[PDB]
Design a protein around this ligand. Structure first.
Ligand SMILES: Nc1nc2c(c(=O)[nH]1)N[C@H](CNc1ccc(C(=O)N[C@@H](CCC(=O)O)C(=O)O)cc1)CN2
Ligand SMILES: Nc1nc2c(c(=O)[nH]1)N[C@H](CNc1ccc(C(=O)N[C@@H](CCC(=O)O)C(=O)O)cc1)CN2
Ligand SMILES: *[C@H]1[C@@H]([N+](=O)[O-])C(=O)NC(=O)N1[C@H]1C[C@H](O)[C@@H](COP(=O)(O)O)O1
Ligand SMILES: *[C@H]1[C@@H]([N+](=O)[O-])C(=O)NC(=O)N1[C@H]1C[C@H](O)[C@@H](COP(=O)(O)O)O1
Lengths: 264, 264
């Protein structure tokens, strides 16, 4: 997609060489923002084939509040295997914080239910936020959340969302993260009877790994194709009741997939 | 400042009318980003006189971990009076979360000390974050944090910072918020022996109140003046030991102040 290839080029032209946690090395920029009008189409990268199966299942897994990889394996999704322990556990990552953020006085807060309540009763609110950045539990997580904090906004009968992503692997992670959140915005809007508006992506440390350079040059040589359309085939009773079979992506005709190693 | 007047104009031209919490009404946009290179000068608005006293003291107050307004009053700062209770308390707002974020298992995490440790030992880290958005304590706060989440970044011997501000009163709040965080970046850099880099501001619901329109038109008629310079006159032993007298703002020659009512 145009905005995505523009970012890739910007990282190549403007990024500075930075060591990293994994020992791999990156080219990095700090602070970037892009906007996707969800009415123009579903923002799934076309310049390489993306695995929709993994994207959709990961999101449904988050929404269940699950942090064990059993569900993903049951569904032949292996994108989280490298970080899981012997029992398939990741610690209280994303889904746990979304559904069951623990308080000092012993409660658990379901941020997704809270957001639904807000959208249905106080749509003008400037506090419609979900955070995964639970400072008190960071040390128990396999990895600190990359996509950390997101906010909804309603104007003129449309639902928008902004994501703050503190760290972004541009080649591997970003195509998944954009699609994942676009999908959530479509689900949320369906449940709230709103139209879709904008998905706004904001990055912190936005980088290309040093061993993704060949892959990046290849993909930059390709022309984007028209965006597909997302069809949700039924309206479940709640945001927690979607199934893989409920989604259709129509007119997705990507260029071939490009393999790249994940930095662990 | 150029970036600031550009935003004001954009809100006037592109903002949609939105009701709000306070009953005042706003023009609102969602999602905006601006960048200030701190080497070009200290980003204090010149098209109206800003009260530096209030800016500096508010920041020092946050850093103490204080949430009672006594300290501000001792220093003749009254910007937080409207939200405080009979005892001058605001609940566990900003400073409390920064210095003493409470965990379930009973601990308190000092995020500022943690960040210092990270900057001094792991400057390449992509996880150098402070959050005020403590989901478990939101209901005890006078107001939910506006400036919610910020990240540091080091490259090439320079310290940058990005702030996510979920809600932004463009006329009243934003000039303070930009200056406040620029100041913190200068303090942090001094303590860590780094040069200053960029301050990146990212907004969620970015708005002009309906009863700030005259004030906005007035200010938009004014030409920005050159940015002042921040001089820090000594190096305290720690980030917690700064005093008001340690800061000099040189060459600040603003246009006159513009009064506007705060929406409560
Ligand atoms: N450094 C690094 N990068 C990352 C993650 C990480 O923790 N470390 N974690 C992220 C969580 N998301 C993904 C997304 C895609 C993949 C991945 O590998 N994807 C394939 C293969 C997909 C498949 O299983 O079929 C691709 O070619 O797009 C891994 C993690 C993404 N990037
Ligand atoms: N709606 C609304 N807007 C806000 C806040 C709010 O909670 N509600 N809280 C914010 C916290 N920051 C400020 C900053 C400035 C002022 C203010 O009023 N400033 C003066 C007067 C300064 C002074 O005391 O001398 C000015 O003209 O700039 C109030 C809160 C800012 N904007
Ligand atoms: C992190 C990631 N995740 O773990 O779920 C995700 O969804 N998107 C990412 O882009 N992603 C990247 C950022 C970085 O390259 C690594 C995480 O490493 P640290 O930033 O060192 O924590 O995965
Ligand atoms: C909030 C504010 N604060 O309370 O400290 C700040 O520092 N900056 C702001 O711009 N600010 C604004 C945003 C909005 O106009 C109100 C808060 O109202 P809600 O967004 O309804 O919580 O103050």
């Amino acid at each position: 997609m145009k905005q995505y290839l523009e970012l890739m080029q910007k990282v190549l032209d403007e990024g500075t060489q930075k060591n990293d946690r994994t020992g791999t090395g990156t080219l990095s920029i700090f602070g970037h923002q892009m906007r996707f009008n969800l009415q123009d189409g579903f923002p799934l990268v076309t310049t390489k084939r993306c695995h929709l199966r993994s994207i959709i299942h990961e999101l449904l897994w988050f929404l269940q509040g699950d942090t064990n990889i059993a569900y993903l394996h049951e569904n032949n999704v292996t994108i989280w295997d490298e970080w899981a322990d012997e029992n398939g556990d990741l610690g209280p990552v994303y889904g746990k914080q979304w559904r069951a953020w623990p308080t000092p006085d012993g409660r658990h807060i379901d941020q997704i239910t809270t957001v639904l309540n807000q959208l249905k009763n106080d749509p003008d609110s400037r506090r419609i936020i979900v955070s995964a950045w639970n400072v008190g539990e960071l040390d128990k997580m396999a990895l600190a959340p990359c996509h950390a904090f997101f906010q909804f906004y309603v104007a003129d009968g449309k639902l928008s969302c902004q994501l703050y992503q503190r760290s972004c692997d541009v080649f591997l992670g970003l195509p998944f993260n954009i699609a994942s959140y676009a999908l959530l915005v479509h689900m949320m809007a369906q449940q709230c009877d709103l139209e879709v508006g904008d998905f706004v992506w904001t990055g912190g440390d936005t980088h290309l790994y040093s061993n993704h350079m060949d892959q990046t040059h290849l993909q930059l040589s390709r022309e984007p194709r028209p965006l597909p359309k997302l069809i949700i085939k039924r309206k479940p009773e709640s945001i927690f009741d979607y199934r893989f079979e409920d989604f259709e992506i129509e007119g997705y005709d990507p260029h071939p997939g490009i393999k790249a190693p994940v930095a662990i």
